[PDB]
Design a protein around this ligand. Structure first.
Ligand SMILES: [Mg+2]
Ligand SMILES: [Mg+2]
Ligand SMILES: [Mg+2]
Ligand SMILES: [Mg+2]
Ligand SMILES: [Mg+2]
Ligand SMILES: [Mg+2]
Ligand SMILES: [Mg+2]
Ligand SMILES: [Mg+2]
Ligand SMILES: [Mg+2]
Ligand SMILES: [Mg+2]
Ligand SMILES: [Mg+2]
Ligand SMILES: [Mg+2]
Ligand SMILES: [Mg+2]
Ligand SMILES: [Mg+2]
Ligand SMILES: [Mg+2]
Lengths: 173, 107, 203, 244, 141, 191
RNA sequence: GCAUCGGUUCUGGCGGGGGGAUAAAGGCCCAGGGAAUGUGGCUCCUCCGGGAGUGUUAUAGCCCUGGGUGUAAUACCCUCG
RNA sequence: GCCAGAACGCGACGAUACUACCCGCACGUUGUAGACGUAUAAGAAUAGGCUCCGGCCUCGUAUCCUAGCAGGCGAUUCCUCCGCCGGCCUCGAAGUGGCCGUCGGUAAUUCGCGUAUUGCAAUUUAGACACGCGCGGGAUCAAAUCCUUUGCAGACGACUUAG
């Protein structure tokens, strides 16, 4: 959907035997903080022996892109569920923000592998700092020196209500 | 001299009734306005008056042509079609006929 | 949109079903349609697929009597287009029959309908829809391998009407020479201030 | 369940509609393909059937069993008095088929052909082509020669109108028969000139056909009133002890 | 062995190429992301032509014949503005055929009814002298 | 995965002329003229240098890019054919029944036709007519040779394949009956 | 038919206030550090367009950290008319 | 090739008495799936085109026409545009257009008289296709069926013939 980054911090309920328990923090991509908390409890239930009934939320914040007007390459590590078994991948994307890469990855996996939102875990998102550390060839092609290309055979836009044009259109824009 | 025409109205067509997929309601009609594409442009003709004129057989009070009067109610869809309400529902045989849209309640 | 008395559509380069949907909507709205050069339409996909589709159509016939009730397989390109349009209209009612009465289809350009302006529907043109590299066929060719007999008659006749149109083009081109030279000579000589007065108004 | 023993069907579905012919005179449906390299010639004739008889001849077929030996064969004789040409017609090609646009007649018509246009000739006034005949000898037939020029200009195939002289046969009938015969020749101008030169003149069968030539015959078969399936199609008869 | 080939040639999309957005705005390309999206901006003194900095899809843009020479890739707004003013992009665009037709079009949607009557009478006044010259030339042939 | 730019080049010798219009190639040189129509492929032609022709595809798929080398080699073959021509050689192979051929001259038109008699001792007289522009000779250099020559590789090769395909043995073991006519050599007329 | 009102409802525009990293960016200015799809120079080859190498701002510019202009503007959410 | 021929698919020709037909205008009982500027003819390509050979092309958001009692009466002005007829050429896919001539009308500029009262809106009764009538001019003076007969036909109708 339309995502944005959050950070959420949780904690086990303090008790007389263990005052001042530990604090856990995660980064979650979610449309809103209502499902951000739900994903926090979902991921934490797989790492520690804490539930929502016996825990509490300390803080929830929103992380915004530092330089949303600069083009950069990203790399994503993830696991998912197939129709039989589980697998790990590593893909790359090229754009201006961290959030849109997660949006593109969700749509890409949903198209190429028929993987829904229910069965994808995000392991790590990293910004590729250099240019010689780009691996995949569909991103290698976009960083060649002096890139330029034409746009042949592009249909002009015509109002959908104006039927019965009076001359043959052209595709030489 | 002065061969020009005499027109002070906008021409429209009578499309159909208001309906679901299997039920129709003759209470309101749908009219396609000339030259209107979007619903923002269709806002100009809200509240105007429309007329439907047709030919009869007998002469009653010096004429053989009758008229049915109505007015535009609200826009319909995203393509500029509009809804209308008349004193009597249209004869349901005029699906494709033409009506006259005046400009009486101006501005 | 606009309301004309009748509109003539040139069929060359139009997808069959996409043109038929627009036509079927206009007929029910109240417009009058005339389709010309029905032998130059196009169908998406490779030709053999269309031939197999037609053979599957041809195998259907009433069992107990083939002279009544059975699907009659018309063999002309205009009749194929007519069948396509007829499938998108409630032709079993009086309203549908009246709508169908507003349609005319021909092969080539008959004499009533030449010397006229021929419109084009841009929502069905092939060059704006299909991928370059894909495959398509021609309805005229499809009718040839199903039993249409008058392919060569129209082909020869169209060369005649196109030769007449070449001379009409020559006359139109010459006429432009006098109108352009007259405008250039006249505009300079006379008008002192109507020129810039029109220019400020955009003319 | 399936049929026990297989057998071919009775009759043929090609000649399926088994109704009386629409018209008494036989109808020709197709003509030989035109070739503009032979001289102009007619391609049809019409006559009356007399009977059959027997001939004797010797055979020339190398490798056969009856080679160079006498054989007996049956033949049929057709009466063929000369026919008379009356006019000609021209056709044009349209995206809907062939169609005729003009026709021209001769100046004088016989009473045999004039009988064909009437159902009660005895009590009529016999005014068939009276007003048409005055088109000759009026401005030297400018109107008549105008359509002939039209045919020379617009037509692609030309046929000729001919009729029989039934009065030279022992038949009681007095009404003649009329038909068209297509002309196959070099060019349309040659066709029309040759056809026009034959007005109200007789043509003999020896100019059309010649010996040992392979021809076709068209006619209407002998009629029977109303018959059952056994004779109409040829099905097996049922056993002797069948009821009803 | 002279060889003559007459084949089409489009306009190249480089850095420094200025586009024309749908709502009459001009923007200069500074970075290419994909074959469908680019990064562009235009600093213009005229408020009608100015556009902010951001990404524009290539399906909503048109390629104008103007190209800014030697524009460094990924330059900031200050450097692009400096090259925009040094090259005089705004002055160059005014005399193109697209701008002139657009202006003659814009003047047409803003016409009072009285001005419509006035332009009708002026057109008839010019047409009267137009037909005299057409008849004179046609008669001479 | 769509490739942004794929390009190839063809050099042209200083002997012939080439002109292209609406993706229709015309090549004419010292030995004649050839025509080819390539309207079914989306390719962009250009003149790279004084004697180099360039052709390229933008935003093509793997399948679309595949045809680029085919187009390049077809036009190069046209250049070769118009400057050096082509020449094929074929041999007759029989065990017992000699096979006799008769390449009679032009039959009132440019096409040649070759008549084949006594194949595996058969009395059929079998006739094949070749496409125009192909010249057939019975070799005199040495015994039992047939020479095919011409300007276009497609026509020369197709006529040779017609000859190869017309001599077939039926209802027999073809590993034992090696009778037939086969092609044996391909090359150019010059050198 | 029009003007002035009452009830229900649809649909436009304008003036403000609050919150978050007291938005994030961004413009101008100050201080420090880097690199390449290496700017200007220099070397070589190619005259046939140009290509290859060296090397950190010069006759283009970019990236990272801190500070001022700042209680900057704008986006999003909420709210008074 | 061959068989049937839509009984609501089409073309050519012959003769047409009863004003049945044709021409001219005169109204209008009467009909219509629905006029209100019912205005616009190159062909061809879409990874290329048009041309006035100078140039032009995303766009019909175009071009033509468009004032006056539903459009009067005169004048100063101006040789444009529009219409009915007549004569020569042309047009055959379901036959159309051009040229010339007579006549009638005509703001491109600028003026003089008349408009009221339908009373503060009520379709602006206005177009072209058929069809029924009334006049006054031209031309024309026909067939089919029943009946008797025939047997190339036949349950009866129907069919091939003769009077
Ligand atoms: Mg039936
Ligand atoms: Mg059984
Ligand atoms: Mg009998
Ligand atoms: Mg038997
Ligand atoms: Mg019994
Ligand atoms: Mg064996
Ligand atoms: Mg209210
Ligand atoms: Mg605020
Ligand atoms: Mg350097
Ligand atoms: Mg602040
Ligand atoms: Mg602030
Ligand atoms: Mg019939
Ligand atoms: Mg009477
Ligand atoms: Mg009477
Ligand atoms: Mg006059």
């Amino acid at each position: 959907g339309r995502l944005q980054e959050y950070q959420v911090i949780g904690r086990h309920l303090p008790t007389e035997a263990n005052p001042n328990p530990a604090l856990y923090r995660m980064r979650i991509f979610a449309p809103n903080e209502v499902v951000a908390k739900s994903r926090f409890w979902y991921f934490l239930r797989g790492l520690k022996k804490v539930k929502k009934a016996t825990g509490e939320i300390v803080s929830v914040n929103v992380i915004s892109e530092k330089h949303p007007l600069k083009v950069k390459n990203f790399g994503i590590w993830l696991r998912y569920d197939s129709r039989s078994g589980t697998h790990n991948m590593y893909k790359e994307y090229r754009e201006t923000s961290r959030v849109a890469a997660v949006e593109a990855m969700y749509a890409d996996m949903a198209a190429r592998h028929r993987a829904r939102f229910r069965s994808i875990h995000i392991l790590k998102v990293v910004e590729l700092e250099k240019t010689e550390d780009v691996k995949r060839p569909y991103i290698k092609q976009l960083v060649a020196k002096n890139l330029s290309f034409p746009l042949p055979h592009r249909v002009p836009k015509i109002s959908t209500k104006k039927i019965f044009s009076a001359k043959r259109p052209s595709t030489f824009s | 001299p002065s061969e020009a025409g005499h027109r002070l109205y906008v021409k429209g067509r009578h499309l159909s009734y208001q309906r679901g997929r299997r039920n129709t309601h003759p209470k309101t009609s749908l009219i396609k306005i000339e030259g209107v594409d979007d619903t923002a442009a269709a806002n100009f003709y809200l509240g105007k008056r429309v007329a439907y004129v047709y030919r009869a057989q007998k002469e009653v009070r010096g004429t053989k042509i009758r008229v049915i009067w109505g007015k535009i109610t609200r826009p319909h869809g995203n393509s500029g079609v509009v809804r209308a309400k008349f004193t009597h529902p249209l004869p349901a045989r005029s699906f494709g006929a033409s009506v006259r849209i005046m400009l009486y309640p101006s501005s | 949109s606009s309301f004309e008395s009748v509109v003539v559509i040139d069929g060359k380069g139009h997808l069959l079903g996409r043109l038929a949907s627009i036509v079927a909507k206009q007929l029910l709205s109240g417009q009058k349609i005339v389709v010309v050069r029905c032998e130059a339409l196009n169908i998406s996909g490779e030709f053999f697929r269309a031939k197999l589709k037609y053979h599957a159509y041809l195998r259907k016939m009433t069992r107990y009597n083939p002279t009544r009730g059975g699907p009659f397989h018309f063999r002309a390109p205009s009749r194929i287009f007519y069948k396509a349009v007829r499938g998108m209209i409630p032709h079993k009612t009086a309203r549908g029959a009246a709508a169908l009465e507003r349609l005319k289809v021909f092969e080539g350009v008959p004499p009533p309908y030449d010397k006229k302006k021929k419109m084009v529907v841009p929502q069905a043109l092939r060059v704006l829809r299909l991928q370059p590299g894909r495959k398509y066929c021609t309805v005229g060719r499809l009718s040839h391998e199903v039993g249409w007999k008058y392919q060569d008659v129209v082909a020869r006749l169209e060369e005649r009407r196109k030769a007449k149109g070449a001379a009409y083009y020559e006359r139109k081109k010459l006429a432009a020479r006098q109108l352009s030279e007259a405008k250039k000579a006249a505009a300079a000589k006379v008008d002192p201030k109507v020129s810039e007065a029109l220019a400020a108004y955009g003319y | 369940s399936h049929r026990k023993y297989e057998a071919p069907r009775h009759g043929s579905l090609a000649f399926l509609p088994r109704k009386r012919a629409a018209r008494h005179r036989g109808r020709v449906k197709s003509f030989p393909k035109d070739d503009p390299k032979k001289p102009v010639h007619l391609t049809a004739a019409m006559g009356y059937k007399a009977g059959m008889t027997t001939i004797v001849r010797d055979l020339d077929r190398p490798g056969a069993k009856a080679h160079k030996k006498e054989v007996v064969e049956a033949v049929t004789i057709i009466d063929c008095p000369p026919m008379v040409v009356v006019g000609l017609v021209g056709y044009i090609e349209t995206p809907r088929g062939l169609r005729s646009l003009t026709t021209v007649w001769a100046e004088h018509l016989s009473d045999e052909v004039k009988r064909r246009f009437y159902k009660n000739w005895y009590k009529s006034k016999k005014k068939a082509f009276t007003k048409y005949a005055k088109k000759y000898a009026e401005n030297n037939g400018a109107s008549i020669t105008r359509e002939l020029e039209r045919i020379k200009k617009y037509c692609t195939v030309v046929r000729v109108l001919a009729h029989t002289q039934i009065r030279k046969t022992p038949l009681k009938q007095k009404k003649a028969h009329l038909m068209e015969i297509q002309i196959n020749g070099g060019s349309v101008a040659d066709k029309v000139e040759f056809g026009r030169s034959l007005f109200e003149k007789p043509v003999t069968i020896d100019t059309i056909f010649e010996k040992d030539e392979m021809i076709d015959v068209i006619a209407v078969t002998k009629g029977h009133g109303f018959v059952g399936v056994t004779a109409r199609w040829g099905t097996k008869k049922l056993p002797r002890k069948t009821h009803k | 062995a002279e060889i003559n080939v007459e084949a089409t040639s489009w306009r190249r999309v480089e850095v420094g190429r200025v586009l024309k957005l749908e709502n009459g705005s001009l923007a200069a390309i500074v970075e290419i992301i994909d074959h469908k999206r680019v990064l562009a901006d235009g600093p213009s003194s005229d408020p009608k032509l100015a556009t902010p900095r951001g990404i524009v899809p290539l399906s909503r843009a048109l390629l104008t014949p103007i190209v800014i020479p030697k524009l460094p890739r990924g330059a900031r707004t200050g450097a692009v503005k400096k090259a925009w003013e040094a090259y005089g992009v705004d002055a160059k665009w005014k005399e193109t055929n697209w701008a002139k037709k657009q202006l003659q079009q814009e003047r047409r949607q803003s016409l009072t009814d009285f001005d419509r009557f006035k332009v009708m009478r002026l057109k008839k006044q010019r047409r009267f002298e137009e037909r005299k010259a057409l008849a004179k030339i046609k008669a001479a042939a | 995965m769509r490739y942004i730019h794929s390009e190839e080049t063809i050099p042209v010798p200083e002997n012939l002329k080439v002109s292209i219009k609406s993706r229709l190639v015309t090549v004419e040189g010292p030995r004649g003229k050839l025509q080819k129509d390539l309207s079914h492929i989306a390719v962009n032609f250009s003149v790279v240098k004084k004697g180099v022709i360039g052709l390229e595809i933008h935003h093509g798929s793997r399948k679309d890019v595949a045809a680029l080398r085919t187009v390049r080699t077809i036009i190069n073959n046209m250049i070769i054919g118009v400057t050096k021509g082509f020449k094929y050689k074929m041999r007759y192979v029989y065990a017992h029944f000699p096979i006799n051929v008769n390449v009679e001259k032009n039959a009132e038109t440019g096409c040649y036709e070759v008549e084949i008699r006594n194949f595996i001792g058969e009395k059929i007289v079998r006739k094949v007519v070749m496409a125009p522009g192909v010249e057939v000779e019975i070799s005199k250099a040495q015994k039992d040779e047939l020479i095919l020559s011409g300007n276009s590789l497609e026509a020369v090769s197709q006529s040779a394949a017609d000859i190869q395909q017309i001599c077939k043995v039926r209802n027999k073991d073809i590993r034992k009956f090696l009778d037939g006519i086969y092609v044996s050599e391909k090359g150019n007329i010059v050198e």
